[PDB]
Amino acid sequence: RYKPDWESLREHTVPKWFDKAKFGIFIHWGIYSVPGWATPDAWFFQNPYAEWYENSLRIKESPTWEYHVKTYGENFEYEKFADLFTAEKWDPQEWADLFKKAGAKYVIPTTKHHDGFCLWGTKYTDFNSVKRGPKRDLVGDLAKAVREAGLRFGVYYSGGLDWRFTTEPIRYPEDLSYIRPNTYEYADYAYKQVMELVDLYLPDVLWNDMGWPEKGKEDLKYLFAYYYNKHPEGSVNDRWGVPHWDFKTAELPGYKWEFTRGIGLSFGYNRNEGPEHMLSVEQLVYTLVDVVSKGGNLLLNVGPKGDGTIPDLQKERLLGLGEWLRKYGDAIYGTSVWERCCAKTEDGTEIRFTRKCNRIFVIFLGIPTGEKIVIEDLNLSAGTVRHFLTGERLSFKNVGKNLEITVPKKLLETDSITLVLEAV
Amino acid sequence: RYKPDWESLREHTVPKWFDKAKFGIFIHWGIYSVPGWATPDAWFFQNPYAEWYENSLRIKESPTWEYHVKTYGENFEYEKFADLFTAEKWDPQEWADLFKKAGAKYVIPTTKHHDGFCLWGTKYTDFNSVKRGPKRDLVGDLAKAVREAGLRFGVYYSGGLDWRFTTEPIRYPEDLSYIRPNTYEYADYAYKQVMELVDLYLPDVLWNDMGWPEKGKEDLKYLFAYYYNKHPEGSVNDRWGVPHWDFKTAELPGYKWEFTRGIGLSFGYNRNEGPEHMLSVEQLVYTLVDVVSKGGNLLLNVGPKGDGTIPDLQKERLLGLGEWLRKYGDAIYGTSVWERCCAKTEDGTEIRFTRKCNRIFVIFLGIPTGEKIVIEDLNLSAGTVRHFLTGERLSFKNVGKNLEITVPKKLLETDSITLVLEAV
Amino acid sequence: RYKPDWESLREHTVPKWFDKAKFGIFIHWGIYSVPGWATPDAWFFQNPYAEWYENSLRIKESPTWEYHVKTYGENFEYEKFADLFTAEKWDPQEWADLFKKAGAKYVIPTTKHHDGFCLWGTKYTDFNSVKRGPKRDLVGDLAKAVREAGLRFGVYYSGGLDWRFTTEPIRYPEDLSYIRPNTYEYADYAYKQVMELVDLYLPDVLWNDMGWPEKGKEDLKYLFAYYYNKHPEGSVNDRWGVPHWDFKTAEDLPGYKWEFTRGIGLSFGYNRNEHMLSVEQLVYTLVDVVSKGGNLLLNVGPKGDGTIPDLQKERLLGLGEWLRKYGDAIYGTSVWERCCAKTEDGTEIRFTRKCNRIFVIFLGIPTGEKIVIEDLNLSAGTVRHFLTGERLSFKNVGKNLEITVPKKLLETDSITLVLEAV
Amino acid sequence: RYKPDWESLREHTVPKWFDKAKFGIFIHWGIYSVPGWATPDAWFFQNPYAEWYENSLRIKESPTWEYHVKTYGENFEYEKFADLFTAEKWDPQEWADLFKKAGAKYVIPTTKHHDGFCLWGTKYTDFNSVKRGPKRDLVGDLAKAVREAGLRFGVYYSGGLDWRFTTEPIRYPEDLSYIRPNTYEYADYAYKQVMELVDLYLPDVLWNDMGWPEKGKEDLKYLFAYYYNKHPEGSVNDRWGVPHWDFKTAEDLPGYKWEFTRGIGLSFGYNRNEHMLSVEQLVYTLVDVVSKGGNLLLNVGPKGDGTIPDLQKERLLGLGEWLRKYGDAIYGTSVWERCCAKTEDGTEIRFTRKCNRIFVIFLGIPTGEKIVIEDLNLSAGTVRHFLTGERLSFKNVGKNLEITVPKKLLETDSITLVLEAV
Numbered sequence A, B: 001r002y003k004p005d006w007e008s009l010r011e012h013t014v015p016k017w018f019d020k021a022k023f024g025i026f027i028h029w030g031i032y033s034v035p036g037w038a039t040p041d042a043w044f045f046q047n048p049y050a051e052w053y054e055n056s057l058r059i060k061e062s063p064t065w066e067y068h069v070k071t072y073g074e075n076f077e078y079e080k081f082a083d084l085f086t087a088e089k090w091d092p093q094e095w096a097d098l099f100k101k102a103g104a105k106y107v108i109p110t111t112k113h114h115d116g117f118c119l120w121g122t123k124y125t126d127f128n129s130v131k132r133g134p135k136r137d138l139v140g141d142l143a144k145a146v147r148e149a150g151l152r153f154g155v156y157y158s159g160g161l162d163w164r165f166t167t168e169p170i171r172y173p174e175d176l177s178y179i180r181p182n183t184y185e186y187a188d189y190a191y192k193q194v195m196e197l198v199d200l201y202l203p204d205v206l207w208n209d210m211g212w213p214e215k216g217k218e219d220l221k222y223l224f225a226y227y228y229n230k231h232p233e234g235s236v237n238d239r240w241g242v243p244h245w246d247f248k249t250a251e252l253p254g255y256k257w258e259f260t261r262g263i264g265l266s267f268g269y270n271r272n273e274g275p276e277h278m279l280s281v282e283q284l285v286y287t288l289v290d291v292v293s294k295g296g297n298l299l300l301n302v303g304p305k306g307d308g309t310i311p312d313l314q315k316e317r318l319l320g321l322g323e324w325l326r327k328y329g330d331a332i333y334g335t336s337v338w339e340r341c342c343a344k345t346e347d348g349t350e351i352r353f354t355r356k357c358n359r360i361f362v363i364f365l366g367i368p369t370g371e372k373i374v375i376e377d378l379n380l381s382a383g384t385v386r387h388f389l390t391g392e393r394l395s396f397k398n399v400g401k402n403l404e405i406t407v408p409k410k411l412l413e414t415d416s417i418t419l420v421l422e423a424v
Numbered sequence C, D: 001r002y003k004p005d006w007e008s009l010r011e012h013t014v015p016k017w018f019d020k021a022k023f024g025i026f027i028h029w030g031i032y033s034v035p036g037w038a039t040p041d042a043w044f045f046q047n048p049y050a051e052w053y054e055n056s057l058r059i060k061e062s063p064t065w066e067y068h069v070k071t072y073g074e075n076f077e078y079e080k081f082a083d084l085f086t087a088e089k090w091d092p093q094e095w096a097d098l099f100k101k102a103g104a105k106y107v108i109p110t111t112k113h114h115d116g117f118c119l120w121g122t123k124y125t126d127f128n129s130v131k132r133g134p135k136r137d138l139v140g141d142l143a144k145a146v147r148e149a150g151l152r153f154g155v156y157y158s159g160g161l162d163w164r165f166t167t168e169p170i171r172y173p174e175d176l177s178y179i180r181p182n183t184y185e186y187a188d189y190a191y192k193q194v195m196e197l198v199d200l201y202l203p204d205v206l207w208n209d210m211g212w213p214e215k216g217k218e219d220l221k222y223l224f225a226y227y228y229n230k231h232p233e234g235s236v237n238d239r240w241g242v243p244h245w246d247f248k249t250a251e252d253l254p255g256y257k258w259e260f261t262r263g264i265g266l267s268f269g270y271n272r273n274e275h276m277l278s279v280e281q282l283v284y285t286l287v288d289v290v291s292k293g294g295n296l297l298l299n300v301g302p303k304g305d306g307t308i309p310d311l312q313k314e315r316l317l318g319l320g321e322w323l324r325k326y327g328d329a330i331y332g333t334s335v336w337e338r339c340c341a342k343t344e345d346g347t348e349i350r351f352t353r354k355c356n357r358i359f360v361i362f363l364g365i366p367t368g369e370k371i372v373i374e375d376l377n378l379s380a381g382t383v384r385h386f387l388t389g390e391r392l393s394f395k396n397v398g399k400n401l402e403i404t405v406p407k408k409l410l411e412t413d414s415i416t417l418v419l420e421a422v
């Protein structure tokens, strides 16, 4: 049993499933998906993030304001998008199947982003998906489908920012130091809402954002102890601004962390986003391997449309990643870091290392065109280095500081995207 | 005038009436009286307290859950008892007469227990006796009747626990450290509700329970100063978790205290309670004398049914106590502690001492069967020891460390339950 | 057992001995007794308190500065008085006997006043009576003598003010809000010194003054718990500025215990330029205070050589001669239903209770046999003349209570007519 | 780089060496080793811990007081033992070699226990081993010797208790809530002393005790950041009473790292009146603790002259002889899917993992060849006898796992039967 104080909650280390998961799906989906628009220290004036539509719209000068006033009209309040957000062609089982085939082991939707619209039937505001728009508990139905597909389910919550409680926009990063809800009322509201998510859906991950209101930071001792006592395999990110977290986030470490990025640049759906603002399947795999070899997990974001469909370009990149993970999944899932993160060849091709007990997977970022491969600054523990995908044994010798190794061309042609070897 | 700070509020000592009162009636009565059921470190799983019905019901495993799901059905929410709680045959004048005849000098009902149902027309929740169930201000009508009978009126309030603000039950004592309302919203709610009781009924006693929310502990400086300034003869118990109290509670001291217990084991009405889970009239009198000789008051609880009647077994024990207090009341009411609490005879019979200026009442817990009574470790201040109930003088001498004294058998037969003497 | 937190320490009510004590002796005695001088909006510029000599001296051109610069010289540092404080003719048994004969039940000397000179062998400063001046543990020798005489022994300590830690004087009351030691170093120093008094002498009273340093206020839950656990009959005044105290102080009827403090004269420390109360006014004060639930802490300001001025000795013995006669109507009494009353004539009256007995103490001796007391009805008891025990006839008349006490008995009483109803 | 705030310091997880270390030596050694005496609701009145000699001595009439007043005399102050603590026959290389042969990977001496005597040349008190007694920097010479033997070196420090700053003893556990130094002066003193240990010896472990003074708890975000930035492989226990620690202590399977501490005997400091564990019980403790994710910190209580009692030396060497054989199944291991298991016979079993290898350590040596382990199914690997490496036949049978190990191999093992599946 966890007690409600920081010393006691430190006893909760990161759960084993999360360290082994390696890959998860972020989902940025709200009423901001309806307009789904964004421009292709002037960051907030030309916000490339479609989720920040309302903030950009509150800046009268901006291109989001130009677009909005021409597409929808000057007197079209942002709140009106809630009724346009009908998710009429949303099938959560189809999402869960997509994410499972993509190779993800956990899924995290935005229960409530900065605009403050909640994607569940919360009883603390009427600005949610049950009373407005979809007339449907989006979080709960996604949680059911995700878990029926055999995946873990987390929740993103914008604890630090809620624009239902402000009127002024963020124009500069320094504005965030005072343009917050700021009231005791909000501190209670955020506490009750995350407590409600825990009670209703018992998430495997509590992914807070933008810090936690200062007035309720000491509430989290009670929230975290409550959560862990109901769900010891539950986890908590590092965006609460308090002494406790299970893993860190980012946009060889001894702690666990998680790199988050979108398939594109924007997190929410953006129409203005060209097909060359997005990563290729190759770049997604390279990111996954790089991150995972450094002890991290990848949280890859998906920005679905307001009608509940995932853009074909995004579906494509997910399935292509999962086709790669279906072949090379044994060298990623359930792996630890090796003695070192990275390495390169004499040629130039970068290399990453993942361990799985006595095995050491050697993952080349790319497929070398030559049979004779020379890896710099490595002298392997004289064992048995073998081709991974076919299993076939391979000859190799040590040379001063580098490591020479021949791999026939007949085997290179089998590998897709990355050549991977495996020592013992 | 009291200032709102702890140093200043210390000037308020316990009121004279309360120290002299000696005996009071607790009343545990709510919507939990309707089901009125309880099982005959596993305490919370088999709670013998019927007031904790809802907590026990939230534990799916428990016998309260078995009973509830069979008597009322799985989908019978606990809140539904509010509408079953009609107090149709409740007459408060009949209660006040009962408590007055029982010998009580003050009466304290549960305005709001842990379940959060209020027995008055509070304007801070619709979960009360005016909007639901009785359609009647139960606290106010009891206050009128109690005061018309010439008794003081206090209020119990569950400041520390309110299950209207939680969903999870208490399974272990350590759960109480974090399964509390916890919000600023609740701290205000509790403050406004006790302030409302003060404004509406001006209670002679403020009997808080389960501590006060940490977020509003400093509010009580303002509450206590406000209260004492309107009502200097008002009093305050020791369950707020702050530096100030007028008397302590429990379940020779220099401070004033108050032992609270039920006629039975449960505080709320329990049907499952046999007639041999309750104290006899003899044991109630023995408790009263023991407590009062140690500087304390007795707060004897009554658990009425949901229809507003007090079980005949409880009525019986109260009237029998009051018949005893009608005879021996002069040795209890308005007494102080003597040089020592207790004493025993050579035979074995225990003895308690109460003072009233130059008088010293000697109350035997039981009626010795022999005329020759030898009291251990006592040498009285050579005065005049007399039989109390008849007044008749009695012979006595000192003997080493003990004190011999003859009391004719004709006088023993007059005394009911306790022989009592009286020195000068 | 007492825990170190305010909620737990509230369980310590005022000890029974202190409530019954009624009368105690304050002693303001230090190196300020050596010059022992004070002048006969601008209170601090013309301080009538001789203990504040150093503060007044730091105010250049003030009358204490004029006197000092002429009697001792401009370059005569105040600290130099420590070596002049010899306590030549000091006899603690003589003091303890004087206070016992005066009728006092407890005695409280200044272990350290605002100037910061300590009257004991403290190991936290060398500015004390053992290393300087008397070469003698003044507090400890007085404690031994006072307890041998059968009296309780308390300690005054200036926790809030210490002029060893400041250089600027107090010219106005608002100056006290910032001209304090202010350092963590001082907060520890004060804690360690009161801890040391407790360890060395285990005082029955801890009489702090001028509040406690803000930084050390949380230290006192520990100090008080430590103190009460070693000495449950110990007590603590109300000048720490924290939620806990046993009795209040002061310079219808309260439910708490309090203590009026005042000197025989106006000054607390010895003053030559000294305005003194008569024996009659001291008795009247005692009775007034005691009938209102309070104790009287009467101050004595001895000279630097260790003798108590004859005028002060005289007032104390005269008070004790009165207390020897009428002590049963004061010591061990509680308050009655009301404190005060007057006669049709004008003479004020005070009431003390002692169980079923209720003493009626006249502030003065009425010159007439027929006495009419206003707004008082006594439930037909037996009103006795107190000192002789003789019975007196009384009747109830409307609001008032007519009583007839013979001339023989009025001339018997000294200072106060005292009756005794039941 | 680590910033001085709790959120940043959480990034420091327990160092890999400490998780792999498994076994370490505690050393309770001070001036309390000189008398080295302790008696065979009232724990503090009959303290079995010889390190608490002074506390027990402050309790007048207690058995430590009887012994002390007869062996040394009533006017023999406890502080006088500092001059008796000569460490005559002390040889740090002899100690370091003993601990290395015992199989320990790290060593932690008491730099300062509750009595406040420091075993190094601190410049914040003259009550230490350089100015008194040994005339020698005991901590530094042990640190040099321990690191020369190839072992890690930590430091115990009594941050929460220091009896140089109190006079009253601890009679009950509730006394610890207020009988502490309590001053800002102490909070600085503790900070400066641990800062000084870090600067002088850069310990691999900072083993604080009895919490950290309330006034100095915020100082520790700075001390910890300073420490980790100079020494990232450094570690910190859980007895500071702040949000941060690297491992917990103690006197299904945890996710955090912890450390069981206990003496060879009952007392931590040397006791004559001493109740000791056998070699078998020490090995059983080590295996039990290690299979549950913990380390064992085994205490040694040397005499005042600098020698370790032969009985203690004996137990340590016997443990190291066992660890020399079975060290591969302990050092560098993680926890398995579950900690514990038993046979149909009754013999307890513990599991340690080392990648794909899973060691099966029997607490005792089964007398029969046919061994049936309850509730255990092993995925058909290759179960080897550990010490000889020979292969063993096994079958899965319902819930259990039948295995046949020849008598030849059971008689080979010492204390524990050890197998090795894959």
Ligand SMILES: C[C@@H]1O[C@H](O)[C@@H](O)[C@H](O)[C@@H]1O
Binding pocket: A049, A051, A052, A209, A210, A260, A267
């Ligand atoms: C994952 C990203 O985190 C950031 O803090 C947010 O501002 C973005 O909108 C997005 O949710």
Ligand SMILES: C[C@@H]1O[C@H](O)[C@@H](O)[C@H](O)[C@@H]1O
Binding pocket: B049, B051, B052, B209, B210, B260, B267
């Ligand atoms: C008098 C008793 O006090 C306790 O704290 C409560 O838990 C019981 O329900 C009851 O009200």
Ligand SMILES: C[C@@H]1O[C@H](O)[C@@H](O)[C@H](O)[C@@H]1O
Binding pocket: C028, C049, C051, C052, C209, C210, C261, C268
């Ligand atoms: C009793 C008086 O208390 C005051 O606070 C002090 O300033 C006086 O010097 C005197 O000691």
Ligand SMILES: C[C@@H]1O[C@H](O)[C@@H](O)[C@H](O)[C@@H]1O
Binding pocket: D028, D049, D051, D052, D209, D210, D261, D268
């Ligand atoms: C390891 C033990 O820790 C406890 O806190 C101490 O009181 C003992 O003396 C010993 O050092």
